[PDB]
């Protein structure tokens, strides 16, 4: 009784596509491009080489390309009704059938779960997700005898290999296991194998895995009390805001198996109600992911993330189209599809094409947003403050650990202006799929640099990373939201605390995005309040992008560059210059992509200002030679850092005009600096312009009245903060 | 008798413009933008502050902005027939008249010719060129009494100040003097003052200047026996190919006064035949300058050049429109005008707009080109070799000294792919008009780093710059063309020699851009043959752009960074790693803007391979932290460096696919290495792909027969080289 195809491309979908071909431009353009790709591969023949290589290498790239081409051939067969596509799928499947059973585990030994076609089970699982879709498309074209042999000798052994033979890969809450569960589930659905479908949804019972078993990136395989399978992978790593705990680079990857397998489940097993699971989180998570991109569509590089990954990727084409068709037809998704310029060649892609043709498209709104972390939304979060039409974007990370790929960077932030990074989060130390760089895999410096606290724009105590850079400790902890208030577009404030990163120390960081009179643009205000039980060394880095223009302090230029320290990331920084503050406010200004920036920070006379450059202890040139300025405050117990980051003016090498190149800050001053209250006065060099930010530190309640005095003057307000103009 | 205006905007021009307004989109759009700009400044008022500042500072930027706005107000007055513009010009001129006479020499003392309005006479001259045009536009609106006072108390004294009172500025063959000559000449022509007109054309008679005195940038003020004035500035620093000896950044700046003053001379003194002068060189030089830009229209950064200067600049808007109107109406110039998206608000800009409306536009062809240097084309040259549609561009500099801004860089090259710099020429050390960077003026490191040989991709002998970095030596010498042959678009070759850079050493460098079977793209072949009479240390830098991917040799990574040397630029390089070749060919690959590149060079086992990084002894962060690889060959007399630079493959962080990431070179071998003949064998990996280049070094005659033997086999050809496929 089951029709084929039916999981993703459906028979009713084929009919409708055919009726519309020639009058759906984005679809017609995709079809033509895909037809040319597949026809090219058909001319080259069928190559199924004996495994051997890591990423970037021939056997990896060939087997990878085969999976993409098979899924494309399948939809081409159905849409065009042209058997050359089916014959190619059939021949290729049988060539795999003739080699796969005789293969020995991948000869490369790095993976905690060595694959057969690829170095790791993750890529074997990618292959099966894509190939299942091809099989659904040729299932009726094949004879019963042919299906029986493929299922017995190719598909069933393959599905076992990436599941019951490698439970350490398959049975976790992790993007790996989501790929594995989907692979097993997609082929199960095509075949009507109820055992495999149950294994996909619920995992393996009694896996026998030992205590403390880890993956290659330092993460635990299993967590006590945690379920396995697809449904557990929806329930645990997504918050109620649709925020995926590994961060957006990983979320981007995981959306393919999440949304493909959900779509398949919706079409074949509607009683599962997969698109309702956890209050509709999968569909919601698509809007959330799109909001975690800068003005160019590039995902913010939180935790292990390669820069340049964006919503133009194949996973976001898939996610946008599926969310459009199976969700409530959000017309904002249509504008993303138009930017992508392609669609899936299936029912969901057609629906997007027709939505565009009918003039339904609306601009995707990028707004200030609060995202909770943890399954129940109580394990910290991430906040994005935006000004104007994405004119300025502040990303503040007060999240949980983030699994194996997570960084030791409680309360870090990064800053963007219209697609240009100004203060960065480093991302990963890996050149993804570039064979010549460690087989395209994680490099040693991902651990030694990238993940360490000193690499991030946040507080480092005693040259030690948050939670001593120990996964097993960090994974128990998260920062805590104090408050989020972005209702006033001119004055948006978020605040969070962290008391476990350094036991005996409390960090309370408040960030604001503020437009006020005297300034050409909004500025970022950063208040980092530190309470401790002992005198420590505190470092606060700012990793800035651009060319240094000016400072209001002197600094030394050493004749030779030495590393800043010996451990925990400090071995990777060259000491490029050492300054002493001239007064209460120190300034550093730079030029990046035609715009000037100024960092102003409240300094004491014993502060050290360290110019740094990344690149020490990097024998393979695995790290970028980016710079930073670190404020070091020695022998200090309780302290409050106060900083402003301004954007002003411009420079063009065409006109040779430099405009508004100086700061407009006259003075920043702490007026009150106690446990209960923090008050910062901001004086704008614009003649007469003064503002006062007051924070109540010990009670967040929006209806709580506060009464303080500053120089004999009473200030009275309700709620955790006030911003006032001083006249 | 003389009409006003008539120099640049003419009265028949004004009538034709008014008849066409509203049906000439590029002109209509420009008029609207300029109207809004001038109307804004009129609302702000008239400010003529007491001069104090360097470039980027308030008084410099305000007086500069006034000159641009006055010239815009003048054409607006005429075109729109609206006396608001004329009244603004009058009021501003009278405000200048009230202050100028009482002003003392600019108080900044860092110009060899301090101005009055500005720190230097160069900028006073800019002001007068622009204001002259405005005066022409309001001449009839003013009363005779008003003109008399302006002329007596502002214009005549101004013109004298920048000329007869500062002959050291005014009477040279130099871009400065071209601006000074045009300033005096433009105001002379508006006024009908024969004295000033002659002074402009023919210079100051008996100037009394010392021969051997220097300007602040280290070049000679005056050359014995050399004429002065506008005509001398056309005859002397332009070659017969329209190449301006100072290089394209400076040529760009000089075109404004050259073409503006030439246009005024054409309209007011047609008997001068200015557009025929030196065989039409001024019109020709516009094409030449456009040919000295990369695929994005950015000028190659030869000699003192700021990167990002482009044909979108105000000077090239001006040059393009004038050359179109007064030259032979070359329709290729119309495509540049379309990219610029604006035109001059005058007769020439009208002619461009009409050319575009009538569909005359044709694409500007960027070709391989040989440019001679020196007034008679015998003082070396510059070669540009291009492949395909600016797919790859090699720039080879074998020029004369280049006057004061020239670099010690005989036979250096740079390499570009579709607007991306792959191997660079550093350009200047100066942040043009950015006050915070030493007043926007040349920095100390422009002499200590930028101009030195070690900063360039060319031979350095015994850690010493060409000509010992002395202007008085280098200014007497030039490299010599051996041959240029670009007729075969697959195999283009240029060769030059230099024997005075290091007395007792001969450098013979041959560069080729070669497309052959077995390579996806054209490659650069570089043969640097060196003959000497002592054993020396030879250094060969390659300043590459991008992320290091791979080497075929081991290298050390020191625990601290030390400077590479003590003098002549080596004090600005950190030694970042030291390698020794493993074989006959050493390889370095990198990734830049999505593409891979491989440098392969013939090494002896005693060679040292130095990774370097610019930035030592740079206390104010005036230098970029770019990298290089230096080949160092010690204790060597005669040697030949052979290198290939390939472009291959692609990387995308969206798809995460790395394609064709390895070199296709199997080997390069020197088959013959004598004074008379050089032969280089290139084997591609494809196997069956082998090529041989043979150079005859002591006879360039295209009809001379050569017979040689290599490995027992006879090779016979005519002319200075042969490139043959070995079968
Ligand atoms: O194709 C891939 O192997 C791949 C693509 C994703 O974009 C992402 O880079 C993913 O990283 C893996 C990695 O290959 C290892 O399996 C391990 O470190 O886990 C990573 C992950 O969890 O995403 O790999
Ligand atoms: O506005 C300028 O001062 C200016 C514009 C040109 O683009 C170019 O940069 C030029 O440089 C001058 C410099 O200001 C000094 O006058 C001296 O060093 O000479 C340079 C030159 O001849 O170009 O300045
Ligand atoms: Ca990070
Ligand atoms: Ca140079
Ligand atoms: Mg998961
Ligand atoms: Mg942004
Ligand atoms: Mg001035
Ligand atoms: Mg470029």
Automatic annotation (TrEMBL), chains A, B:
Domain Heparinase II/III-like C-terminal: 372-624
InterPro entries with a match to the protein in the record: Alginate_lyase_dom, Chondroitin_lyas, Hepar_II_III_C
Binding site residues for Ca(2+): 407, 409, 425, 456
Location(s) in or outside the cell: Periplasm
Membrane-crossing residue ranges in chain numbering: none
A single Gene Ontology CC term: periplasmic space
Protein name: Alginate lyase, family PL17
Organism: Zobellia galactanivorans (strain DSM 12802 / CCUG 47099 / CIP 106680 / NCIMB 13871 / Dsij)
Lineage: Bacteria, Pseudomonadati, Bacteroidota, Flavobacteriia, Flavobacteriales
């Amino acid at each position: 009784a089951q029709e084929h195809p039916s999981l993703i491309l459906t028979k009713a979908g084929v009919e409708k596509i055919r009726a519309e071909l020639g009058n759906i431009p984005i679809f017609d353009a995709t079809l033509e491009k895909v037809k040319a790709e597949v026809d090219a591969e058909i001319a080259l023949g069928i190559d199924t080489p004996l495994p051997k290589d890591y990423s970037g290498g021939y056997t990896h790239e060939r087997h990878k390309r085969n999976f993409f081409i098979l899924q494309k051939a399948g939809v081409l067969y159905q849409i065009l009704n042209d058997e050359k596509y089916a014959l190619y799928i059939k021949d290729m499947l049988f060539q795999y059938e003739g080699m796969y059973k005789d293969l020995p585990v991948h000869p490369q030994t790095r993976s905690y779960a060595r694959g057969k076609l690829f170095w790791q089970c993750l890529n074997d699982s990618n292959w099966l997700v894509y190939v299942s879709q091809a099989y659904d498309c040729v299932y009726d074209y094949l004879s019963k005898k042919e299906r029986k042999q493929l299922e017995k000798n190719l598909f069933r052994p393959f599905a076992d290999y990436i599941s019951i033979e490698n439970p350490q890969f398959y049975n976790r809450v992790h993007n790996h296991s989501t790929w594995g569960n989907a692979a097993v589930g997609m082929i199960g659905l095509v075949m009507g194998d109820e055992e495999l479908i149950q294994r996909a949804l619920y995992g393996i019972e009694d896996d026998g895995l030992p205590i403390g078993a880890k993956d290659n990136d330092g993460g635990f395989i299993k967590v006590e009390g945690q379920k396995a399978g697809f449904l557990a992978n929806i329930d645990e790593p997504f918050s109620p805001d649709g925020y995926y705990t590994e961060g957006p680079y990983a979320q981007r990857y995981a959306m393919y198996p999440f949304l493909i397998f959900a779509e398949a489940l919706h079409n074949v097993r509607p009683q599962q109600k997969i698109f309702e699971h956890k209050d509709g989180v999968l569909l919601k998570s698509v809007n959330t992911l799109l909001s975690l991109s800068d003005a160019d569509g590039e995902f913010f590089p939180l935790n292990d993330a390669q820069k340049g990954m964006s919503y133009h990727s194949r996973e976001l084409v898939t996610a946008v189209d599926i969310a459009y068709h199976y969700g409530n037809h959000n017309p904002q998704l249509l504008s993303i599809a138009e930017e992508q310029g392609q669609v899936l060649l299936d029912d969901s892609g057609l629906a997007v094409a027709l939505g565009i043709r009918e003039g339904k498209s609306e601009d995707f709104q990028k707004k200030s947003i609060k995202l909770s972390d943890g399954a129940n939304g109580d394990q910290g979060g991430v906040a994005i403050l935006r000004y104007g039409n994405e004119a300025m974007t502040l990303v503040y990370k007060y999240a949980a650990q983030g699994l194996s790929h997570g960084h030791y960077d409680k309360l870090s932030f990064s800053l963007y202006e219209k697609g240009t990074e100004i203060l960065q989060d480093y991302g990963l130390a890996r050149f993804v799929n570039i064979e010549q760089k460690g087989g395209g895999n994680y490099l040693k410096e991902n651990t030694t640099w990238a993940k360490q606290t000193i690499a991030h724009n946040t507080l480092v105590q005693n040259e030690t990373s948050h939670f001593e850079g120990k996964y097993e400790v960090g994974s128990q902890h998260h920062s805590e939201l104090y408050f989020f208030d972005a209702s006033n577009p001119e004055v948006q404030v978020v605040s969070a605390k962290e008391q476990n990163a350094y036991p005996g120390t409390e960090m309370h960081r408040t960030m604001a995005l503020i437009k006020t009179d005297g300034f050409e643009k909004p500025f970022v205000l950063d208040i980092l309040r530190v309470g401790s039980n002992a005198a420590n060394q505190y470092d606060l880095p700012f990793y800035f992008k651009g060319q240094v223009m000016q400072t209001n302090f002197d600094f030394t230029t050493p004749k030779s560059l030495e590393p800043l320290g010996s451990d925990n990331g400090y071995q990777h920084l060259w000491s490029e210059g050492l300054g002493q503050p001239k007064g209460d406010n120190s300034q550093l200004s730079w030029l990046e992509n035609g715009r000037f920036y100024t960092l102003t920070t409240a300094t004491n006379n014993d502060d050290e200002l360290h110019f740094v450059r990344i690149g020490a202890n990097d024998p393979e040139f695995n790290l970028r030679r980016d710079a930073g300025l670190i404020i070091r405050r020695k022998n200090t117990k309780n302290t409050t850092f106060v900083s402003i980051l301004e954007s002003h003016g411009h420079y063009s090498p065409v006109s040779e005009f430099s405009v508004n190149a100086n700061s407009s800050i006259s003075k920043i001053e702490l007026m009150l600096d106690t446990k209960e209250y923090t008050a910062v006065l901001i004086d704008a060099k614009s003649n007469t312009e003064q503002t006062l930010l007051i924070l109540a530190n010990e009670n967040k309640n929006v209806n709580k009245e506060h009464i303080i005095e500053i120089k004999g003057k009473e200030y009275r307000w309700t709620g955790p903060y006030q911003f006032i103009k001083i006249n």
